[PDB]
Amino acid sequence: NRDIAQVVTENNKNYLVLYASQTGTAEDYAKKFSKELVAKFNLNVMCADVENYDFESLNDVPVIVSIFISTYGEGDFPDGAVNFEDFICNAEAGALSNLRYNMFGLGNSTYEFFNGAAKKAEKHLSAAGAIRLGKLGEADDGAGTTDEDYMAWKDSILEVLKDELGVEATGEESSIRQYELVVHTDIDAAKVYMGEMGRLKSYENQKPPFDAKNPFLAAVTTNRKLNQGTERHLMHLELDISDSKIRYESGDHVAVYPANDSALVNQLGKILGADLDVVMSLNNLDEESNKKHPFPCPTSYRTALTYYLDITNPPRTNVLYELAQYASEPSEQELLRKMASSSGEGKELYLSWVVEARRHILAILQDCPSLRPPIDHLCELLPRLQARYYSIASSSKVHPNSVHICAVVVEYETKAGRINKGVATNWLRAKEPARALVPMFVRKSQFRLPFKATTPVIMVGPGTGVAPFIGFIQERAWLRQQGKEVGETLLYYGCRRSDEDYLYREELAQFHRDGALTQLNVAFSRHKVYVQHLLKQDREHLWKLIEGGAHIYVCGDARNMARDVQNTFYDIVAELGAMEHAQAVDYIKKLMTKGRYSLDVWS
Ligand SMILES: Cc1cc2nc3c(=O)[nH]c(=O)nc-3n(C[C@H](O)[C@H](O)[C@H](O)COP(=O)(O)OP(=O)(O)OC[C@H]3O[C@@H](n4cnc5c(N)ncnc54)[C@H](O)[C@@H]3O)c2cc1C
Ligand SMILES: Cc1cc2nc3c(=O)[nH]c(=O)nc-3n(C[C@H](O)[C@H](O)[C@H](O)COP(=O)(O)O)c2cc1C
């Protein structure tokens, strides 16, 4: 009841404000401070009149204590606060070593002992081992300064507390703009970036060598549905690289710089209120830094959103944080800051609402209608639009001037009822051969057919992971057509169904007919027949091939399939080689080192 440490603990207080007051001024300001403590840190504050407690347990109060105290005699406390005074003056060395406090005394210089109470108190607190945080305040009612004396003191202690308690004050946007807006409302189109990636006008000029910094614009020669079913769209594209001088081999990847859907970009401009044809630059406030801009400038908002900015993936923590100020509806602003937080609770609301719902920026704007930022701050915060990679599905020996892509279109419904569209694949799908140009480049990999033709090859490529092997098979067929003896060429393919999603049914059957493909092993899942079982089934034969210097290749979207396939090979070497599992793994390791076990797995 009168035990101050007891009462503080019982009631789960984060912070204690005490006051001693004859005529209500200290009480008033102790209350004003408490109110500000809560408004800014959302603490659970007790604010109590010293007169109502015994203080023998002052040292056991486990929160920070503010003390407001008035002077009334010979530097005495108010007569009602006798018990509080008798404790502070009797306090022996070390008695209050756990007490962390701040203090604001109330006095009047027109009396003999200006602020004697708070001055005495502080001598005794520190003498007994307590640590004061911040300055000792001393209101002067004699000068008429008390309110401003408090104002100054309060601002001070709140800065001290911001570090002591961690955290930031509600009502604060420590928001740092990295770049600055300049509107180029007059400038000629030749100086303005139009969606090209490196040097200005490079999509026009097109001079070798083409690469990541300078992609070749390849015409789309073919674009056909590969699959029988309607659930999914899987497609085969052909990219004309005639006159590029780009060299590739089977096993290489082709990278592609897509465009965002223009309808999406429009919808975005319409909800931001922004006119997107405004050409502009975002110049770095760090004048001496390397990145002068977040993306090629001068450029229009339409262009940045279309070609240089990622607007489809879930925005990150820091972009929610920075957008939160632009939410006029307070409860919408609370959401965003919470989702931007380091809180277990906030992180978790973020994962499900932002990440798991796959909410892109437009979706966040639409569902938080009071969030209305300026386009230029948004463009600064959004991540860069990345290139997208595909396993070339052609051999350069039959298609030297053509690069083939095999891809499933990403198109799916979210928890929140939206339909999301994968950028590159829907873009590629909309490319009609009747010119339609795809910015691209080739990155070399170490995924290669054996250069010694007689060497057997074992390809494991379920689903879209057949991609690289289509080119491997074209190539091997080609080697046979040229008079070379070619070793066995085994494909272990997989899909759901033969009349739904059998990729390259004609071509693989025909390559098999012509003897180019020695074996087409398909594992249609739809009872759960995956490729692992086909490998185990054919284990006896696979071990001969392996022992005969065969090369193994694993391709596909799923890391687990690769892992299951590797495990299956571990068991085959274990059984048929007659060795310990540990030796089996080390054998397959040796293969990898020799370059006879290669992977192309995309996660
Ligand atoms: C080296 C390499 C080679 C590759 N080769 C090929 C290839 O030959 N063929 C191929 O098909 N892929 C391949 N991949 C993937 C390919 O690069 C693209 O990521 C893919 O085509 C999707 O791109 P997008 O722009 O259409 O989708 P994006 O706009 O990038 O969206 C893809 C994202 O959407 C999300 N997503 C997808 N489906 C769902 C779902 N149903 N529910 C919720 N979220 C979902 C995922 O988070 C995924 O990261 C390869 C990857 C790498 C790294
Ligand atoms: C009778 C009386 C004695 C006072 N003695 C002092 C004093 O010794 N030193 C001082 O600085 N102020 C003195 N004051 C000023 C008070 O401390 C000042 O008015 C203060 O704001 C009172 O706060 P409170 O309303 O919480 O009691 C005195 C005021 C009165 C009314």
XYZ file of C-alpha atoms and ligand atoms in Angstrom:
687
model
C 0.000 0.000 0.000
C 2.567 2.568 1.203
C 5.526 0.472 -0.029
C 6.673 2.370 -3.151
C 8.803 -0.455 -4.621
C 6.016 -2.961 -3.891
C 3.336 -0.822 -5.588
C 5.550 -0.073 -8.615
C 6.236 -3.775 -9.205
C 2.667 -5.009 -8.498
C 1.158 -2.622 -11.028
C 3.783 -3.265 -13.737
C 5.040 0.325 -14.035
C 7.881 1.101 -16.488
C 8.701 4.487 -14.925
C 8.104 6.349 -11.646
C 7.467 10.090 -11.303
C 7.413 11.300 -7.686
C 6.500 14.764 -6.436
C 6.571 16.737 -3.171
C 4.318 19.773 -3.239
C 2.638 22.053 -0.684
C 0.693 24.253 -3.075
C 0.365 22.073 -6.213
C 3.015 23.419 -8.603
C 5.361 20.398 -8.322
C 2.278 18.172 -8.610
C 1.203 19.993 -11.774
C 4.578 19.666 -13.471
C 5.118 16.067 -12.287
C 1.795 15.343 -14.011
C 2.662 17.305 -17.180
C 5.895 15.312 -17.509
C 4.211 11.954 -16.981
C 1.677 12.801 -19.708
C 4.577 13.594 -22.076
C 6.475 10.403 -21.107
C 3.443 8.315 -22.128
C 2.607 10.302 -25.274
C 6.156 9.818 -26.627
C 7.443 6.478 -25.280
C 4.160 4.737 -24.457
C 5.545 3.748 -21.032
C 3.391 2.652 -18.115
C 3.928 5.499 -15.692
C 3.103 5.901 -12.035
C 2.836 9.525 -10.848
C 2.479 9.691 -7.075
C 2.450 12.190 -4.225
C 5.416 11.467 -1.976
C 3.083 12.039 1.028
C 1.316 8.675 0.427
C 4.219 6.209 0.630
C 6.941 4.927 2.904
C 10.319 4.957 1.125
C 12.341 2.301 2.989
C 12.302 0.278 -0.252
C 13.303 3.204 -2.570
C 16.445 1.276 -3.517
C 14.314 -1.674 -4.756
C 12.358 0.355 -7.323
C 13.438 -1.264 -10.626
C 12.453 1.660 -12.916
C 13.841 5.144 -13.567
C 12.577 7.710 -11.056
C 11.847 11.372 -11.852
C 11.534 13.556 -8.744
C 9.813 16.975 -8.677
C 10.314 18.762 -5.360
C 9.573 22.168 -3.863
C 11.404 24.268 -1.270
C 9.614 25.818 1.768
C 11.758 26.921 4.736
C 15.499 26.765 5.274
C 15.802 24.680 2.110
C 13.243 22.307 3.654
C 10.790 20.074 1.796
C 7.050 20.811 2.089
C 5.904 19.868 5.621
C 3.656 17.073 4.274
C 6.642 15.301 2.669
C 8.468 14.866 6.028
C 8.748 11.088 5.655
C 10.306 11.401 2.160
C 12.765 13.988 3.517
C 13.760 11.937 6.583
C 14.656 9.069 4.252
C 16.774 11.123 1.820
C 18.830 12.728 4.643
C 19.300 9.480 6.609
C 20.480 7.690 3.442
C 23.829 6.073 4.250
C 26.680 5.267 1.866
C 25.588 2.805 -0.845
C 21.947 2.785 0.368
C 20.590 3.884 -3.045
C 23.203 2.454 -5.454
C 20.508 0.951 -7.739
C 18.451 4.159 -7.883
C 18.693 5.871 -11.276
C 16.928 9.235 -11.172
C 16.480 12.678 -12.653
C 15.331 15.750 -10.761
C 13.554 19.061 -11.191
C 13.341 21.264 -8.091
C 10.880 24.142 -7.693
C 11.897 27.291 -5.864
C 12.015 31.061 -5.835
C 15.282 33.071 -5.753
C 13.480 35.816 -3.835
C 13.815 33.625 -0.718
C 17.025 32.971 1.238
C 17.837 29.396 0.106
C 17.050 29.129 -3.622
C 16.015 25.530 -4.396
C 17.484 24.229 -1.139
C 15.224 21.167 -1.161
C 16.263 19.874 -4.595
C 19.859 20.938 -3.859
C 19.911 19.061 -0.530
C 18.132 16.059 -2.111
C 20.728 15.766 -4.865
C 23.689 15.941 -2.457
C 22.135 13.076 -0.470
C 21.057 10.922 -3.424
C 24.525 10.904 -4.999
C 26.171 10.646 -1.551
C 24.127 7.422 -1.076
C 25.147 6.065 -4.518
C 22.249 6.981 -6.852
C 23.064 8.034 -10.443
C 21.350 11.171 -11.758
C 20.539 11.218 -15.474
C 20.546 14.618 -17.207
C 20.783 18.067 -15.634
C 19.304 19.070 -12.296
C 16.406 21.457 -13.042
C 15.712 24.484 -10.848
C 12.505 26.395 -11.554
C 12.635 30.025 -10.424
C 9.222 31.344 -9.510
C 10.942 34.569 -8.353
C 12.045 35.338 -11.914
C 8.702 34.175 -13.361
C 10.646 31.530 -15.331
C 9.137 28.306 -13.890
C 7.279 27.201 -17.020
C 10.175 27.844 -19.375
C 12.558 26.385 -16.766
C 10.423 23.197 -16.931
C 10.104 23.300 -20.768
C 13.880 23.468 -21.165
C 14.451 20.738 -18.562
C 11.855 18.412 -20.046
C 13.204 18.657 -23.610
C 16.620 17.862 -22.088
C 15.634 14.750 -20.057
C 13.656 13.282 -22.989
C 16.870 13.246 -25.037
C 18.693 11.594 -22.110
C 15.871 9.056 -21.800
C 15.778 8.261 -25.559
C 19.249 6.707 -25.043
C 18.567 5.255 -21.561
C 15.375 3.430 -22.578
C 16.321 2.917 -26.214
C 13.541 3.708 -28.720
C 12.403 6.869 -30.514
C 9.675 9.398 -29.729
C 6.263 8.832 -31.301
C 6.081 11.908 -33.500
C 9.400 11.639 -35.348
C 10.482 10.597 -38.807
C 14.247 10.211 -38.743
C 13.719 9.951 -42.505
C 16.823 10.474 -44.636
C 16.338 11.434 -48.300
C 19.358 10.046 -50.174
C 18.573 11.885 -53.450
C 17.040 15.201 -54.553
C 14.469 16.015 -57.246
C 15.173 18.234 -60.257
C 12.513 18.514 -62.971
C 13.912 18.727 -66.521
C 10.774 20.235 -68.106
C 12.946 21.426 -70.992
C 15.619 19.064 -72.356
C 15.998 17.268 -75.706
C 15.047 13.587 -76.060
C 18.594 12.661 -77.121
C 19.814 13.425 -73.563
C 16.974 11.438 -71.921
C 17.201 7.739 -70.967
C 14.362 5.702 -72.483
C 14.830 2.340 -70.723
C 18.363 1.445 -71.841
C 20.709 0.103 -69.220
C 24.277 1.428 -69.643
C 25.493 4.202 -71.917
C 22.765 6.515 -73.209
C 21.266 5.473 -76.586
C 22.913 2.011 -76.386
C 19.674 0.261 -77.411
C 19.915 2.390 -80.576
C 23.669 2.240 -81.233
C 24.230 -1.473 -80.500
C 28.006 -1.934 -80.749
C 29.779 -5.107 -79.615
C 30.644 -6.555 -77.220
C 27.151 -7.138 -75.822
C 27.003 -8.142 -72.152
C 25.397 -7.266 -68.781
C 26.183 -3.541 -69.174
C 25.290 -3.461 -72.878
C 22.588 -5.999 -73.837
C 21.787 -7.021 -77.433
C 18.233 -6.442 -78.658
C 17.292 -9.835 -80.086
C 14.177 -10.283 -82.248
C 11.720 -12.983 -81.167
C 11.610 -15.562 -83.957
C 9.324 -18.142 -82.352
C 6.995 -18.067 -79.346
C 4.755 -21.103 -78.933
C 2.831 -22.836 -76.159
C 4.706 -26.044 -75.255
C 2.017 -27.646 -73.100
C -1.288 -29.416 -73.715
C -3.081 -28.201 -70.550
C -4.717 -24.885 -69.551
C -3.865 -24.664 -65.815
C -0.375 -23.502 -66.836
C 1.311 -21.754 -69.741
C 4.758 -23.088 -70.595
C 6.430 -21.539 -73.628
C 9.339 -22.004 -76.040
C 10.911 -18.806 -77.374
C 13.668 -18.359 -79.952
C 15.897 -15.269 -79.829
C 17.681 -14.137 -82.988
C 21.270 -13.100 -82.166
C 22.317 -12.790 -85.824
C 24.998 -10.088 -86.205
C 25.564 -9.731 -82.424
C 28.837 -11.718 -82.312
C 27.559 -13.247 -79.055
C 28.958 -16.764 -78.522
C 27.233 -19.430 -76.464
C 27.289 -23.108 -75.741
C 24.642 -25.450 -74.376
C 24.546 -25.155 -70.576
C 24.977 -21.394 -70.658
C 22.291 -19.066 -69.387
C 20.682 -16.180 -71.240
C 19.808 -13.115 -69.207
C 16.974 -10.793 -70.103
C 16.010 -7.266 -68.982
C 12.222 -7.255 -68.921
C 9.650 -4.482 -68.698
C 6.940 -4.018 -66.099
C 3.348 -4.297 -67.315
C 2.277 -0.848 -68.575
C -1.237 -1.224 -67.120
C 0.405 -1.782 -63.719
C 2.611 1.286 -64.222
C -0.446 3.349 -65.233
C -2.510 2.230 -62.241
C 0.458 3.192 -60.077
C 0.686 6.698 -61.585
C -3.064 7.210 -61.192
C -3.089 6.371 -57.459
C 0.051 8.432 -56.704
C -1.611 11.424 -58.369
C 1.639 11.854 -60.293
C 2.029 12.667 -63.984
C 4.507 10.022 -65.163
C 5.760 11.707 -68.370
C 7.609 14.311 -66.277
C 11.271 13.787 -67.249
C 13.611 14.205 -64.252
C 16.793 13.323 -62.351
C 17.383 12.216 -58.765
C 20.782 13.576 -57.814
C 22.653 12.305 -54.756
C 22.730 14.566 -51.676
C 26.134 12.981 -50.966
C 27.802 15.105 -53.692
C 31.078 13.106 -53.651
C 29.510 9.607 -53.907
C 29.821 7.217 -56.870
C 26.093 6.564 -57.467
C 24.948 9.974 -58.736
C 21.478 8.510 -59.397
C 19.360 5.526 -58.240
C 18.841 4.624 -61.917
C 19.740 6.079 -65.343
C 18.872 9.803 -65.491
C 17.556 12.039 -66.927
C 14.489 9.811 -67.365
C 10.701 9.937 -66.965
C 8.760 8.363 -64.092
C 6.966 6.231 -66.693
C 10.358 4.966 -67.895
C 11.856 4.371 -64.405
C 8.772 2.417 -63.302
C 8.698 0.505 -66.603
C 12.351 -0.454 -67.089
C 14.547 0.342 -64.059
C 12.374 -0.236 -60.985
C 11.052 -3.298 -59.204
C 7.395 -2.575 -58.459
C 6.046 -6.142 -58.290
C 7.898 -7.797 -55.403
C 6.997 -7.251 -51.758
C 8.555 -3.992 -50.553
C 11.161 -4.224 -47.804
C 11.084 -3.022 -44.197
C 12.894 0.251 -44.898
C 10.496 1.274 -47.708
C 7.491 0.722 -45.435
C 9.272 2.695 -42.722
C 9.906 5.652 -45.062
C 6.409 5.603 -46.646
C 4.669 5.523 -43.220
C 4.773 9.321 -42.868
C 2.571 9.675 -45.969
C -0.366 7.772 -44.420
C -2.818 10.477 -43.260
C -5.105 7.932 -41.571
C -3.350 7.396 -38.194
C -4.230 3.688 -37.895
C -2.783 3.082 -41.388
C 0.386 4.897 -40.287
C 0.485 2.662 -37.190
C 0.278 -0.503 -39.332
C 3.205 0.480 -41.533
C 5.543 1.518 -38.736
C 4.661 -1.697 -36.901
C 5.389 -3.772 -40.038
C 8.603 -1.751 -40.467
C 9.541 -2.585 -36.819
C 12.043 -4.955 -35.279
C 9.192 -6.325 -33.060
C 8.391 -10.027 -33.141
C 4.791 -8.863 -33.580
C 5.645 -6.386 -36.343
C 7.982 -8.747 -38.211
C 5.191 -11.299 -38.202
C 2.465 -8.947 -39.467
C 4.924 -8.018 -42.224
C 5.641 -11.622 -43.227
C 1.973 -12.503 -43.663
C 0.486 -9.208 -44.927
C 3.376 -7.977 -47.099
C 5.532 -11.000 -47.963
C 3.104 -13.949 -47.837
C 0.254 -12.033 -49.499
C 2.884 -10.982 -52.090
C 1.629 -7.414 -51.775
C 3.389 -5.191 -54.286
C 3.516 -1.418 -53.752
C 0.309 -0.828 -55.758
C -1.510 -3.364 -53.559
C -0.251 -1.646 -50.402
C -1.378 1.732 -51.774
C -4.808 0.378 -52.762
C -5.444 -1.289 -49.372
C -4.084 1.680 -47.444
C -5.955 4.424 -49.383
C -4.652 7.201 -47.091
C -1.028 6.330 -47.913
C -0.247 8.950 -50.580
C 3.490 9.539 -51.083
C 5.237 11.655 -53.742
C 6.357 9.599 -56.777
C 9.951 10.848 -56.483
C 10.424 9.559 -52.907
C 8.967 6.204 -53.971
C 11.270 5.838 -57.018
C 14.208 6.477 -54.703
C 13.160 3.653 -52.339
C 12.087 0.898 -54.746
C 14.725 -1.700 -55.589
C 16.314 -1.978 -59.057
C 14.658 -4.153 -61.694
C 16.980 -7.148 -62.077
C 17.768 -9.217 -65.140
C 16.195 -12.665 -65.307
C 18.064 -15.842 -66.275
C 17.063 -18.824 -68.404
C 18.927 -22.000 -69.294
C 19.557 -21.755 -73.041
C 17.613 -24.673 -74.615
C 19.500 -24.802 -77.920
C 22.930 -25.964 -79.075
C 25.116 -23.316 -80.712
C 26.243 -26.068 -83.132
C 22.754 -26.291 -84.717
C 21.576 -22.797 -83.692
C 24.698 -20.530 -83.732
C 22.659 -17.367 -84.362
C 19.606 -18.339 -82.288
C 19.166 -18.726 -78.472
C 16.202 -20.777 -77.194
C 14.316 -20.294 -73.895
C 11.966 -22.707 -72.135
C 9.882 -21.174 -69.361
C 6.704 -21.505 -67.330
C 4.681 -18.268 -67.024
C 4.312 -17.108 -63.414
C 0.662 -16.259 -62.862
C -1.093 -16.968 -59.556
C -3.765 -15.800 -57.103
C -2.717 -14.341 -53.739
C -4.288 -14.804 -50.274
C -5.761 -11.356 -50.801
C -7.618 -12.386 -53.991
C -5.273 -10.542 -56.368
C -3.731 -12.114 -59.455
C 0.060 -11.556 -59.512
C 2.000 -11.717 -62.787
C 5.699 -12.594 -62.977
C 7.431 -9.780 -64.809
C 9.791 -11.349 -67.348
C 7.656 -14.333 -68.286
C 4.417 -12.422 -68.975
C 6.500 -9.840 -70.848
C 8.200 -12.576 -72.893
C 4.815 -14.222 -73.510
C 3.388 -10.949 -74.935
C 6.271 -10.755 -77.419
C 4.656 -11.614 -80.762
C 6.910 -12.588 -83.685
C 4.653 -10.378 -85.930
C 9.911 -6.345 -84.671
C 9.542 -7.549 -81.055
C 12.901 -7.117 -79.318
C 14.258 -8.564 -76.084
C 17.288 -6.997 -74.420
C 19.573 -9.904 -73.501
C 23.080 -11.192 -72.889
C 24.828 -14.516 -72.234
C 26.707 -15.554 -69.124
C 29.060 -18.497 -69.439
C 28.648 -21.408 -67.047
C 30.729 -24.577 -66.528
C 27.730 -26.798 -67.365
C 28.938 -28.600 -70.499
C 28.478 -31.744 -72.512
C 31.645 -33.830 -72.484
C 34.005 -32.684 -75.245
C 34.956 -36.334 -75.738
C 31.920 -37.550 -77.710
C 32.155 -41.182 -76.616
C 31.535 -40.260 -72.965
C 28.071 -41.313 -71.657
C 25.765 -38.567 -70.307
C 23.064 -38.897 -67.634
C 20.642 -35.949 -67.558
C 18.126 -35.481 -64.719
C 15.752 -32.591 -65.474
C 12.153 -32.672 -64.212
C 9.624 -30.057 -65.431
C 11.129 -26.906 -66.954
C 14.558 -28.302 -65.963
C 14.565 -30.299 -69.215
C 15.557 -26.913 -70.749
C 19.338 -27.258 -70.995
C 19.056 -30.898 -72.015
C 16.995 -30.055 -75.109
C 20.162 -28.369 -76.398
C 22.386 -31.205 -75.116
C 20.296 -33.630 -77.192
C 20.269 -31.426 -80.317
C 24.038 -31.258 -79.902
C 24.570 -34.970 -79.439
C 22.340 -35.732 -82.405
C 24.453 -33.235 -84.349
C 27.676 -35.033 -83.356
C 26.203 -38.333 -84.636
C 25.120 -36.599 -87.869
C 28.776 -35.504 -88.295
C 30.180 -39.078 -88.170
C 31.275 -39.033 -84.511
C 30.577 -42.001 -82.276
C 28.525 -40.777 -79.341
C 28.112 -42.576 -76.026
C 24.758 -43.280 -74.399
C 22.556 -40.221 -73.788
C 19.994 -40.839 -71.021
C 17.308 -38.296 -70.081
C 15.399 -38.665 -66.807
C 12.466 -36.301 -67.331
C 9.423 -35.682 -65.150
C 6.024 -34.031 -65.264
C 2.484 -34.355 -63.881
C 0.805 -35.890 -66.934
C 1.436 -36.819 -70.586
C -1.637 -34.900 -71.869
C -1.143 -31.842 -69.611
C 2.519 -30.808 -69.318
C 4.817 -33.064 -71.353
C 7.401 -30.578 -72.597
C 8.809 -31.287 -76.076
C 6.822 -34.517 -76.597
C 7.402 -34.497 -80.362
C 11.088 -33.527 -80.346
C 12.111 -35.994 -77.640
C 10.199 -38.850 -79.264
C 11.881 -37.995 -82.588
C 15.385 -37.654 -81.073
C 14.711 -41.074 -79.531
C 13.544 -42.435 -82.922
C 16.727 -41.158 -84.576
C 18.794 -42.742 -81.767
C 20.095 -39.358 -80.624
C 18.459 -39.966 -77.266
C 19.344 -43.516 -76.191
C 16.650 -43.528 -73.495
C 13.715 -41.283 -72.647
C 12.766 -42.052 -69.060
C 9.675 -40.069 -68.018
C 8.282 -40.193 -64.474
C 4.734 -38.801 -64.552
C 3.779 -38.073 -60.929
C -0.026 -37.921 -61.298
C 0.998 -42.380 -57.882
C 3.804 -39.932 -56.953
C 6.305 -41.438 -59.434
C 9.236 -38.976 -59.293
C 12.562 -39.286 -61.141
C 14.339 -40.684 -58.016
C 12.573 -44.022 -58.489
C 13.509 -44.178 -62.191
C 17.156 -43.650 -61.162
C 16.912 -46.382 -58.500
C 15.054 -48.610 -60.969
C 17.844 -48.273 -63.570
C 20.600 -48.382 -60.907
C 22.483 -51.397 -62.304
C 22.898 -49.747 -65.723
C 23.696 -46.278 -64.295
C 26.615 -47.676 -62.248
C 28.245 -49.165 -65.384
C 27.938 -45.823 -67.145
C 29.285 -43.918 -64.108
C 32.153 -46.404 -63.734
C 32.760 -45.931 -67.473
C 33.390 -42.192 -66.985
C 29.845 -40.863 -67.566
C 28.872 -37.280 -66.798
C 25.868 -36.537 -64.621
C 23.729 -33.387 -64.936
C 20.952 -32.192 -62.647
C 18.742 -29.252 -63.595
C 15.566 -27.661 -62.231
C 13.760 -25.108 -60.085
C 13.755 -27.094 -56.816
C 16.779 -27.494 -54.499
C 15.069 -30.537 -52.904
C 14.788 -32.482 -56.151
C 18.509 -31.890 -56.704
C 19.082 -33.107 -53.111
C 16.879 -36.181 -53.515
C 18.597 -36.992 -56.837
C 22.022 -36.672 -55.194
C 20.858 -38.901 -52.308
C 19.597 -41.478 -54.833
C 23.008 -41.507 -56.541
C 24.634 -41.826 -53.099
C 22.698 -45.062 -52.500
C 23.473 -46.426 -56.002
C 27.219 -45.988 -55.498
C 26.834 -47.445 -51.977
C 25.062 -50.631 -53.122
C 26.580 -51.369 -56.546
C 30.086 -50.102 -55.686
C 29.995 -52.018 -52.390
C 31.193 -49.128 -50.200
C 30.185 -47.241 -47.054
C 27.688 -44.409 -47.485
C 30.432 -41.961 -46.446
C 32.694 -43.283 -49.216
C 29.734 -43.039 -51.635
C 29.275 -39.308 -50.941
C 33.049 -38.797 -51.311
C 32.988 -40.607 -54.694
C 30.235 -38.322 -55.987
C 32.308 -35.460 -54.540
C 35.260 -36.637 -56.699
C 32.989 -36.614 -59.738
C 32.007 -33.000 -58.981
C 35.648 -31.977 -58.663
C 36.482 -33.672 -61.982
C 33.459 -31.893 -63.525
C 31.515 -35.115 -64.034
C 28.597 -34.215 -61.722
C 27.211 -30.775 -62.641
C 24.137 -28.834 -61.440
C 21.954 -26.041 -62.852
C 19.381 -25.563 -60.076
C 17.618 -22.233 -59.693
C 16.904 -21.869 -55.945
C 20.540 -19.192 -63.450
C 19.049 -19.359 -63.513
C 18.457 -19.959 -64.627
C 17.080 -20.122 -64.690
N 16.523 -20.719 -65.804
C 15.153 -20.880 -65.885
C 14.568 -21.477 -67.010
O 15.244 -21.872 -67.953
N 13.199 -21.637 -67.062
C 12.401 -21.210 -66.022
O 11.185 -21.369 -66.097
N 12.973 -20.615 -64.906
C 14.342 -20.441 -64.827
N 14.894 -19.836 -63.708
C 13.936 -18.631 -63.059
C 13.791 -17.382 -63.928
O 15.000 -16.653 -63.989
C 12.707 -16.445 -63.411
O 12.905 -16.244 -62.031
C 11.279 -16.946 -63.672
O 11.058 -17.061 -65.066
C 10.231 -16.011 -63.090
O 10.517 -14.702 -63.522
P 9.356 -13.605 -63.624
O 9.959 -12.265 -63.957
O 8.301 -14.053 -64.605
O 8.697 -13.637 -62.162
P 9.047 -12.590 -61.004
O 8.400 -11.257 -61.308
O 10.511 -12.447 -60.650
O 8.331 -13.319 -59.788
C 8.889 -14.552 -59.366
C 8.593 -14.663 -57.892
O 7.206 -14.851 -57.762
C 6.920 -15.583 -56.599
N 5.961 -16.649 -56.939
C 5.981 -17.457 -58.058
N 4.930 -18.314 -57.994
C 4.247 -18.057 -56.850
C 3.111 -18.620 -56.293
N 2.360 -19.422 -57.042
N 2.640 -18.145 -55.081
C 3.270 -17.095 -54.428
N 4.416 -16.560 -54.991
C 4.885 -17.018 -56.179
C 8.251 -16.139 -56.099
O 8.625 -15.442 -54.935
C 9.248 -15.828 -57.192
O 10.493 -15.440 -56.674
C 16.276 -19.679 -63.639
C 16.873 -19.086 -62.528
C 18.251 -18.922 -62.459
C 18.876 -18.283 -61.244
C 5.999 30.135 2.644
C 6.835 29.787 1.498
C 8.205 29.540 1.651
C 9.035 29.399 0.539
N 10.385 29.167 0.722
C 11.226 29.034 -0.363
C 12.589 28.804 -0.190
O 13.097 28.734 0.930
N 13.405 28.674 -1.293
C 12.904 28.758 -2.576
O 13.656 28.635 -3.554
N 11.553 28.977 -2.747
C 10.708 29.122 -1.653
N 9.354 29.340 -1.846
C 8.807 29.228 -3.251
C 8.139 27.890 -3.566
O 9.070 26.836 -3.500
C 7.562 27.968 -4.966
O 6.429 28.803 -4.890
C 7.215 26.608 -5.590
O 6.715 26.805 -6.898
C 6.187 25.838 -4.755
O 5.809 24.648 -5.408
P 4.564 23.798 -4.865
O 3.292 24.485 -5.305
O 4.628 22.424 -5.485
O 4.557 23.725 -3.360
C 8.502 29.491 -0.751
C 7.125 29.735 -0.900
C 6.300 29.868 0.216
C 4.843 30.055 -0.165
